[PDB]
């Protein structure tokens, strides 16, 4: 099975550096590309960079820009992600994804690293935060600052589930395209700049934080969150 184990939670003082592991197993870890994400209080996702470990390849987030490296390490088949110059406001939990391109994002997370600190395509997500009675439908829209059309019949836009206490979770990809597992009551419309998510039936395990992202264009960016609470 696909794994991403991360490093233990670490506590920094502000200017020192943190360096966080993300060791892979279950596949050919060359084959893939590892990006880092991370999760700031204020719960919007923040793409930090990417790694193609076959050849040590990197892209980062301009934001980012001489305070970040990423590097890995084929024989541990193990990512790192290191940043630098910590302030109070890189305290986050810092989260490696492997991305595909059958669905063009992040389909396995790591669990995640808390690190307290003692031409970006923007997304707009709507509601913030809703409650629905339970056996209700829901709906979360997501529209962005451009078309995410990347080409004839793919638009890199997903949407996750963060479960409380848990990783970000693939439900949809490519606008409407079901994860594994993921039962027909999530279904993902729209084109364009304008998508939506809509919940058919409501369950108890269906509560979290739930995110729209687009890949169609670096640096990859996500939507800020649309809590869902059943009562």
């Known amino acids: 099975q696909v794994q991403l184990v991360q490093s233990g939670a670490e506590v920094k003082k502000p200017g020192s550096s943190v360096k966080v592991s993300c060791k892979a197993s279950?596949?050919?870890?060359?084959?893939?590309?590892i990006h880092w994400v991370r999760q700031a209080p204020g719960q919007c996702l923040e793409w930090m960079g990417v790694?193609?470990?076959?050849?040590?390849?990197?892209d980062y987030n301009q934001r980012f820009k001489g305070r970040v490296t990423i590097t890995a390490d084929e024989s541990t088949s193990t990512a790192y992600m290191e940043l630098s110059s910590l302030r109070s406001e890189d305290t986050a939990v810092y989260y490696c994804?492997?991305?595909?391109?059958?669905?063009?994002?992040?389909?396995?997370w790591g669990q995640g690293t808390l690190v307290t600190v003692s031409v970006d395509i923007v997304m707009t997500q709507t509601p913030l935060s809703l409650s629905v009675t339970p056996g209700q439908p829901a709906s979360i829209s997501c529209r962005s600052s451009?078309?995410?059309?990347?080409?004839?019949?793919?638009?890199?836009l997903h949407w996750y589930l963060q479960k409380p206490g848990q990783s970000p979770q693939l439900l949809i990809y490519?606008?409407?395209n079901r994860f594994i597992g993921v039962p027909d009551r999530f279904s993902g419309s729209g084109s364009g700049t304008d998508f939506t998510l809509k919940i058919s039936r409501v369950e108890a395990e269906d509560v979290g934080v739930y995110y729209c992202?687009?890949?169609?264009?670096?640096?990859?960016?996500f939507g800020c969150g649309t809590k869902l609470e059943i009562k």
């Open positions: 994804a492997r991305y595909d391109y059958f669905t063009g994002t992040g389909v396995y």
């Open positions: 279950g596949y050919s870890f060359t084959d893939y590309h």
């Open positions: 790694i193609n470990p076959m050849y040590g390849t990197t």
């Open positions: 451009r078309s995410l059309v990347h080409s004839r019949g793919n638009t890199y």
């Open positions: 490519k606008v409407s």
């Open positions: 992202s687009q890949s169609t264009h670096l640096p990859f960016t």
